[PDB]
Design a protein around this ligand. Structure first.
Ligand SMILES: Nc1nc2c(ncn2[C@@H]2O[C@H](COP(=O)(O)OP(=O)(O)OP(=O)(O)O)[C@@H](O)[C@H]2O)c(=O)[nH]1
Ligand SMILES: Nc1nc2c(ncn2[C@@H]2O[C@H](COP(=O)(O)OP(=O)(O)O)[C@@H](O)[C@H]2O)c(=O)[nH]1
Ligand SMILES: Nc1nc2c(ncn2[C@@H]2O[C@H](COP(=O)(O)OP(=O)(O)O)[C@@H](O)[C@H]2O)c(=O)[nH]1
Ligand SMILES: [Mg+2]
Lengths: 17, 54, 436, 439, 428
């Protein structure tokens, strides 16, 4: 979830968020 | 009752602590390097449970 | 006021750096959320050395973490103490280096360095008086040694009047886990000898050896190995952050160690390390630190100083303590070991004392040793590189990325000049003057 | 009147100045807040503190000291400690990024940077002095700031003030123990420029006071905070003739003339007696002859050098407490008839005596005992030529193949400064033997 | 201040040291945990001679244990007084010698000396003024004799101006329980005569003879034998720890008992030995100690000084007592037997007195004797060696491990010269 760029990403949950 | 007396106290080696009195020491933290993660205190229990699982 | 900007390169650098920020946040009393929960008032007196003020009384580290594989960056993010880092500082690529030095130095890493130097410049210019940089990386990989050495060359040109430390994980013969280690090693030693002020050789054999016969540790996990690495690197700059009776930062250490700018490969060592079954049988006293600091067991490289000569040495002590014993014990080992210490330079031991001890310990010490016995590692790297480069093995993985075959030949000549340069100083007559 | 300005420079300067100014406040009845108690404040309240403390109309008493350092981690302890409200906030000057144990760094790059500010505070403190005896400089030879910054401090102080008295209380490098490596490089380059710009330069080293504290004080491991108390006791005995009365009065410019017979030889040695334990004072009565033979004894010498190997040239004695002039001269005549002590032939009279009425004061937590009488000695001896001979040995054996020179040439001095500094000292070594040969 | 470093080699060295640290921890008032629990102040005055200082007022012995088999090491650590030793002091090898002198001295002992010389240098430099060393080992087995001679041979040049004592379990003809035992005895005496300040000969025949005739115990276990020999080993260094009216440290004994540098083989004894039935009936009196000592049964070797001449004699007494009766009785025993002493040394007696008695006892005595009767022992070893070497028996276990035949020849010739040197003082 943290490793994907801001494009090419589905809406996921970032760690500590 | 002289200043800097603890450096010259003859009984300083008697009135001291070894810093690992028990495994549940509150003052032993990660920056103090007398407690380590790899000390497998549950090693034999884990081995027995692995044997039961097998 | 004297800021150290931290640099992490590669997977090995991030595992070391994550434990390093954990060990000194506990030292300064910082929760994983970011605030301050401590008991003393001198812990915030000098905290801008490594930390940067944020809003609401929050401290964020002055570290940047760089890798070419995104798998490590999420692990160092979602780790035990990964929340405190600013998410801007996590810079990463998408395709790995592949344990290849040529990919990290010429093709893959040549595009990532534009993003890294913008973040490094942005974070170094914010300091009121920058002290120097500091890098942790491993020479056995592709994204730590290929691109970390490129970060060495750009920074030294941009900031010449600054001091740079590096913590190089020198490769090891016996516990080697990668075939192309001497390829990645000898192409990076030339970059570390030309453009680096201090280099510390940390070896995985000695970390395994300390964890086996000294700690009597059952399972020496990489977290336990990085626990020892973060020990010396926290203790080497403890005079910067805490007041003491005799203060000496890393620049004053650099002046007293390096006699010539090609001689900066040191050996670290942490003094007060005991096992669980032997700690309560041992008294903590200044001679007990000096005996455990100077023996060859606690050296953190694969170097035996018996084969070589100690060129110049350090001791950085920690704790409230009377320094007759500091001024006496290293004199005693100076007078006894006459052959190990070179007679060309008199009283080569450098001494520093810091008042504030590490948390939970009353007394501690740290060692930095410049010896000629470091040349046996470069000779071992030379013979393993010579035996394989002669058959042109694994060469198409390197020569297909644009570098010709003469870069290997000049890399041999630079290291063979280095091992000969140490050899003249080992066997030199003090009571004579030459043509000059 | 009778004012002298003390400047503490380097880490060794401010650590000595902490224990020295603590002794001055207790001796004059000053708390760390800075106001004298109202039982002792009258309009005719004794103005003996004007030698050191200035006056403010409210009742504050600001010391006339300048604290110079290049690293702020030692001045912050002064700003936070017990005497926070005593010192003036502008008289504690600090810098950044220190000097890193380097003569060239503290003389050319970093030192020249912070010298306009220091000389401003000197002018602001010397403009209040109605009669100024001179400047006292507290430093060490080994450190970068104590070697580099003090080397051009004298150059500008001789420009700013022509013939004013300049005294040194310098930590000489010990012949065995040292905390540095490039310390012999600093010691050559300091003395080379201090020779023509210093009036007098007292000599102390740490290991020779270390042996005194181990044997004569019944403590087995002192540190710096109880090593500066003895140095504060010596400088208290030097200036106590100005502060309090006595049978014989000695100013700052008296023993400068009486101990320096030649322009190149201004290195006397400072010894103190009796340094005795408080339990030991129960059994020992302290006579005038008892305390003046301990000063001449080579065991109680505060420099690791034996005066039996050389010849005395001048001596200065400063007696404090309950002494009579008859017992001083009977003891002095006893000293002259002994054959262990040797004077040069061209100095048939090598003594000077000062008498002070007030006994030395005691500090709580201190090591020394509350005594009735004491004497400190400033003696200039030919036997310090072995100290330069060993120190020239460590320089030449290190400069044998140009070690640690790239840390000096790249900072702003040329390579030729090393050649003119030891040639000056090699002439100074031939100078010491030429004086010491009898006619 | 003056400190003694203890060495233990082999199974016998470990057993004799475990009992020795058991009896002097009780002498200095030390519990099995290690903390001092005493009743006086004279016990605590001299502790640094044998113990170190640790955290929490603990004392660990200045001893190192050396073995080539971990089986005996486990029993020592699991004993009543096995917790007091530091675990770093135990040095063990994973492959033993097997009653072979060549394994312990050439092949297997060469790898293990790097750890022992690391450990013994690690704690002897912590002494402010090292007084001397001490070794206990057995000649009947190659674990503590092959390497035990090599430890002596390596420590001599490292620390030249010191004094070292060794307690050698010299083998016996009737308690000979190993066949290759004359090879182990002869090849170790050669190394012992050249690199040792002081030697002691303790024999299991004499220990069995004492416990039979004197103590009247039905079952003389090795604990009873270790009790008897360590009552003398504690009894020889009493002036260092407990002050007395006339003191004599180990160097003062050596200068009056070694007249020639190759004559340092002494045989000991302990005076107040009594059965439980006879304990009620004896009287504690000064001539009772010297009369029960100079009795030839009471000695701790398989030799009789009646066959020889008392070269020099030392007596160390324990207990607050009058010394006029000490001087009177020892003069009386010197003059009444005018044929058992040499003519060329008048006043053959060295005397010392310690105030503090051993625990549970009123008065005691310890005797060290140099005599010509030791050459009877050396000839007995040499006659069995030459009766079995001359047919090349058991030689393939020695000539195949890196030893030529000339080491056996020079070991016989040096022992032949040594008994000839001892013989010349029997006559002249
Ligand atoms: N006698 C005595 N000597 C001291 C004391 N403090 C420091 N020194 C001496 O000072 C030397 C170290 O150099 P410093 O003068 O402290 O260095 P510095 O003036 O801070 O200059 P840099 O550290 O190079 O920036 C040591 O060798 C000590 O001998 C002190 O309190 N008493
Ligand atoms: N001391 C230490 N060594 C490590 C750690 N992680 C990896 N290594 C060593 O690094 C070597 C591989 O490095 P590598 O991951 O390829 O470096 P990179 O490609 O630059 O990230 C292995 O031989 C490991 O022994 C660590 O946390 N501590
Ligand atoms: N006096 C005495 N002799 C012993 C003791 N233990 C063993 N021995 C003798 O030593 C011989 C065997 O010793 P050994 O274990 O082989 O010694 P090592 O080879 O050095 O371990 C036997 O003949 C025993 O008589 C003891 O506690 N006291
Ligand atoms: Mg400084």
């Amino acid at each position: 979830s943290f490793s994907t760029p801001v494009p090419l990403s589905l809406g996921k949950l970032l760690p500590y968020e | 009752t002289r200043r800097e007396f603890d450096l010259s106290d003859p009984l300083a080696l008697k009135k001291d602590l070894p810093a690992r009195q028990s495994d549940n020491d509150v003052r032993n933290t990660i920056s103090g390097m007398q407690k380590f993660m790899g000390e497998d205190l549950n090693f034999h229990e884990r081995k027995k449970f692995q044997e039961e699982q097998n | 006021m004297r800021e150290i900007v931290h640099l992490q390169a590669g997977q090995c650098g991030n595992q070391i750096g994550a434990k390093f920020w954990e060990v000194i946040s506990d030292e300064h009393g910082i929760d994983p959320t970011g605030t301050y929960h401590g008991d003393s008032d001198l812990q915030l007196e000098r905290i801008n050395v490594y930390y940067n003020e944020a809003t609401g009384g929050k401290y964020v580290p002055r570290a940047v973490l760089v890798d070419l594989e995104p798998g490590t960056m999420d692990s160092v993010r979602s780790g035990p103490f990964g929340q405190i880092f600013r998410p801007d500082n996590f810079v990463f690529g998408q395709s790995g280096a592949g344990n290849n030095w040529a990919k990290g130095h010429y093709t893959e890493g040549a595009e990532l360095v534009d993003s890294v130097l913008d973040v490094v410049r942005k974070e170094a210019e914010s300091c009121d008086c920058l002290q120097g940089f500091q890098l942790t990386h491993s020479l056995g990989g592709g994204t730590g040694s290929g691109m970390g050495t490129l970060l060495i060359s750009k920074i030294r040109e941009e900031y010449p009047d600054r001091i740079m430390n590096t913590f190089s994980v020198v490769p090891s013969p016996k516990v080697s886990d990668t075939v192309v280690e001497p390829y990645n090693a000898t192409l990076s030693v030339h970059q570390l000898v030309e453009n680096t002020d201090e280099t510390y050789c940390i070896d995985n054999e000695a970390l395994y050896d300390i964890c086996f016969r000294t700690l009597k540790l059952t399972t020496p996990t990489y977290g336990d190995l990085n626990h020892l690495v973060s020990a010396t690197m926290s203790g080497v700059t403890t005079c910067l952050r805490f007041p003491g009776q005799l203060n000496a930062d890393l620049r004053k250490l650099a002046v007293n160690m390096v006699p010539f700018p090609r001689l900066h490969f040191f050996m670290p060592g942490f003094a007060p390390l005991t096992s669980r079954g032997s700690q309560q049988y041992r008294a903590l006293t200044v001679p007990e630190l000096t005996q455990q600091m100077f023996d060859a067991k606690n050296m953190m490289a694969a170097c035996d100083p018996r084969h070589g000569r100690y060129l110049t040495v350090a001791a950085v002590f920690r704790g409230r303590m009377s320094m007759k014993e500091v001024d006496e014990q290293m004199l005693n080992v100076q007078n006894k070991n006459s052959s190990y210490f070179v007679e060309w330079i008199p009283n080569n031991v450098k001494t520093a004392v810091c008042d504030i001890p590490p948390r939970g310990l009353k007394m501690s010490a740290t060692f930095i040793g410049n010896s000629t016995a470091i040349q046996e590692l470069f000779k071992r790297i030379s013979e393993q590189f010579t035996a394989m480069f002669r058959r042109k093995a694994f060469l198409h993985w390197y020569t297909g990325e644009g570098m010709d075959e003469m870069e290997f030949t000049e890399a041999e000549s630079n290291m063979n000049d280095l091992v000969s340069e140490y050899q003249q100083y080992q066997d030199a007559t003090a009571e004579e003057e030459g043509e000059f | 009147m009778r004012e002298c300005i003390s400047i503490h420079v380097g880490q060794a300067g401010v650590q000595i100045g902490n224990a020295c100014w603590e002794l001055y406040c207790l001796e004059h009845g000053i708390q760390p807040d800075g106001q004298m108690p109202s039982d002792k404040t009258i309009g005719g309240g004794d103005d003996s503190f004007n030698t050191f403390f200035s006056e403010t109309g409210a009742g504050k008493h600001v010391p006339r000291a300048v604290f110079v350092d290049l690293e702020p981690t030692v001045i912050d302890e002064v700003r936070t400690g017990t005497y926070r409200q005593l010192f003036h906030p502008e008289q504690l000057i600090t810098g950044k990024e220190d000097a890193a144990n380097n003569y060239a760094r503290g003389h050319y790059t970093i030192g020249k940077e912070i010298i306009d500010l220091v000389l401003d505070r000197i002018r602001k403190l010397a403009d209040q002095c109605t009669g100024l005896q001179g400047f006292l400089v507290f430093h060490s030879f080994g450190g970068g700031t104590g070697s580099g910054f003090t080397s051009l401090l004298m150059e500008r102080l001789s420009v700013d003030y022509g013939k004013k008295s300049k005294l040194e209380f310098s930590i000489y490098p010990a012949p065995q123990v040292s905390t540095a490596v490039v310390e012999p490089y600093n010691s050559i380059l300091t003395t080379h420029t201090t020779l023509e710009h210093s009036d007098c330069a007292f000599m102390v080293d740490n290991e020779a006071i270390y042996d005194i504290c181990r044997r004569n004080l019944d403590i087995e491991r002192p540190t710096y905070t109880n090593l500066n108390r003895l140095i504060g006791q010596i400088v208290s005995s030097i200036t106590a003739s100005l502060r309090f009365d006595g049978a014989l009065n000695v100013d700052l410019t008296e023993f400068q003339t009486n101990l320096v017979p030649y322009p190149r030889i201004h290195f006397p040695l400072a010894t103190y007696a009796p340094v005795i334990s408080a339990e030991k004072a129960y059994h020992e009565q302290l006579s005038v002859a008892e305390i003046t033979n301990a000063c001449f004894e080579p065991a109680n010498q505060m420099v690791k050098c034996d005066p039996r190997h050389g010849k005395y040239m001048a001596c200065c004695l400063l007696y404090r407490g309950d002494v009579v002039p008859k017992d001083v001269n009977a003891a002095i005549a006893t000293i002259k008839t002994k054959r262990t002590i040797q004077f040069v032939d061209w100095c048939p009279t090598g003594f000077k005596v000062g008498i002070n009425y007030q006994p030395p004061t005691v500090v709580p937590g201190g090591d020394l005992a509350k005594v009735q009488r004491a004497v400190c000695m400033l003696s200039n001896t030919t036997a310090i030529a072995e100290a330069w001979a060993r120190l020239d040995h460590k320089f030449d054996l290190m400069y044998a193949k140009r070690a640690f020179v790239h840390w000096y040439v790249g900072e702003g001095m040329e390579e030729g400064e090393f050649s003119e500094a030891r040639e000056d000292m090699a002439a100074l070594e031939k100078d010491y033997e030429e004086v010491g040969v009898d006619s």
